[PDB]
Amino acid sequence: RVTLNIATNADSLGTWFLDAVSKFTGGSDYLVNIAVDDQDHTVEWLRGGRVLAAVTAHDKPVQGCRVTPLGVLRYHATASPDFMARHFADGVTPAALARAPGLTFNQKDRLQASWIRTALGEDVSYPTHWLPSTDGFVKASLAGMGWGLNPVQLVAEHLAAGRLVELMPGTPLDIPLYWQVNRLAAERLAGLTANMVGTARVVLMPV
Amino acid sequence: RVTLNIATNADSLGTWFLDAVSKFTGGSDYLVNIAVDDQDHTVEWLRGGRVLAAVTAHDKPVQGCRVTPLGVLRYHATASPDFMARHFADGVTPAALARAPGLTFNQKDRLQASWIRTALGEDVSYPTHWLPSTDGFVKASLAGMGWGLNPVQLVAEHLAAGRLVELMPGTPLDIPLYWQVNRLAAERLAGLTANMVGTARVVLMPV
Ligand SMILES: [Ca+2]
Numbered sequence: 001r002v003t004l005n006i007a008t009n010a011d012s013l014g015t016w017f018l019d020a021v022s023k024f025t026g027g028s029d030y031l032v033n034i035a036v037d038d039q040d041h042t043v044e045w046l047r048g049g050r051v052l053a054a055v056t057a058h059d060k061p062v063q064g065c066r067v068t069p070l071g072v073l074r075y076h077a078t079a080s081p082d083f084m085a086r087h088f089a090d091g092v093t094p095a096a097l098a099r100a101p102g103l104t105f106n107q108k109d110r111l112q113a114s115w116i117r118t119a120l121g122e123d124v125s126y127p128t129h130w131l132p133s134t135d136g137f138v139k140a141s142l143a144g145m146g147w148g149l150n151p152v153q154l155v156a157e158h159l160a161a162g163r164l165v166e167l168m169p170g171t172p173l174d175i176p177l178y179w180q181v182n183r184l185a186a187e188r189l190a191g192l193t194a195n196m197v198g199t200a201r202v203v204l205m206p207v
Numbered sequence: 208r209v210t211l212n213i214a215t216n217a218d219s220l221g222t223w224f225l226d227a228v229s230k231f232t233g234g235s236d237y238l239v240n241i242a243v244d245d246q247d248h249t250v251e252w253l254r255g256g257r258v259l260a261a262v263t264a265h266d267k268p269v270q271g272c273r274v275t276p277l278g279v280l281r282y283h284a285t286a287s288p289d290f291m292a293r294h295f296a297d298g299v300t301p302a303a304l305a306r307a308p309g310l311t312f313n314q315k316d317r318l319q320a321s322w323i324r325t326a327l328g329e330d331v332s333y334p335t336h337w338l339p340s341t342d343g344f345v346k347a348s349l350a351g352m353g354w355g356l357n358p359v360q361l362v363a364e365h366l367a368a369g370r371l372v373e374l375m376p377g378t379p380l381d382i383p384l385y386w387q388v389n390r391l392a393a394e395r396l397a398g399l400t401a402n403m404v405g406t407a408r409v410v411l412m413p414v
């Protein structure tokens with residue numbers, strides 16, 4: 001069998017990516033080698049031919065690559081009811097955010113900072129746990145350990161059930177995603193592309 | 208707040224680890240920095256003081272560390288019914304395993320190889336997808352993409368419902384786990400230890 005090297009961000013792997021990839025592998029003989037990038041190396045990997053294709057938040061064409069917008073991955077800033085009670089008893093304020101334990105994926109994760117900037121109109125430096133795991137983020141949020149930005153696909157049911165609540169309802173953070181494919185592999189991998197684009201169309205918000 | 212550097216394998220992070228850690232953080236002021244090790248660097252990290260404590264399959268004391276056995280993480284070799292139908296129509300045989308797509312976490316993941324060795328009494332080289340994700344492994348198994356070893360905690364309900372089946376019923380793979388703590392931090396972190404050991408007692412199989 002031929003093995004295809006493909007990159008994805010963790011949050012897509014934790015949601016929709018395998019749903020797309022499995023549709024493709026189910027109808028072909030290809031194997032996949034899935035590289036998970038959350039240190040922003042995808043552009044270098046594409047340039048160096050270390051992967052042939054990638055789901056990335058990077059819009060800008062790696063020179064040569066074919067680029068297709070996939071839609072928007074929406075995140076909500078969420079915590080448990082007990083977390084809110086203990087840390088935001090008199091609201092989500094800059095003072096409170098300076099003391100409440102956040103969740104941060106790694107040193108390149110700007111989502112909580114961005115959400116604060118947008119929600120409160122200023123930057124607040126927040127104390128944080130460090131948790132480089134999409135599924136771990138959700139578990140930590142549910143367990144009352146911290147607040148953080150989680151993809152809507154992983155928290156919609158929890159929100160509906162009241163197991164999580166939004167720090168500030170109606171303040172989502174949207175990250176557009178792109179599918180980048182090495183131009184020399186693109187025709188060969190048209191089936192994979194069709195499955196990525198088609199699956200993202202159903203799951204992500206439209207561009 | 209003081210931040211505690213703690214290491215875990217991915218499979219514990221995907222199951223019980225945060226349940227233990229959150230009990231500890233809920234009652235104290237500590238923050239945690241969770242390093243996920245699946246390249247077998249935990250021993251070096253402990254030696255270098257880069258983490259203070261770790262859940263690890265390594266039994267052997269890093270010189271100095273206090274070591275407590277936690278119990279056994281049991282895995283089952285699982286695939287979907289359609290996977291079994293397509294790839295193991297006339298049984299799980301060496302010939303079939305040489306052709307069926309496996310799932311392998313990374314180049315250090317010996318679990319599928321070990322399971323084969325044990326189940327069939329010989330080594331078989333299997334084609335594989337590469338998928339360095341605990342939650343991804345389960346999703347790929349459910350999606351009919353490959354077979355692989357998954358922790359029982361993540362597949363028990365799927366097995367009961369028939370969404371997954373065991374390649375060979377009654378052939379689990381057991382990995383004992385250990386909690387290693389820097390001796391100089393151990394008393395200070397006794398509460399964390401109590402929560403790790405107590406949680407593992409409920410979730411893992413007894414030693
Ligand atoms: Ca996140």
Ligand SMILES: [Ca+2]
Pocket residue numbers: 312318344355356357358
């Ligand atoms: Ca596994």
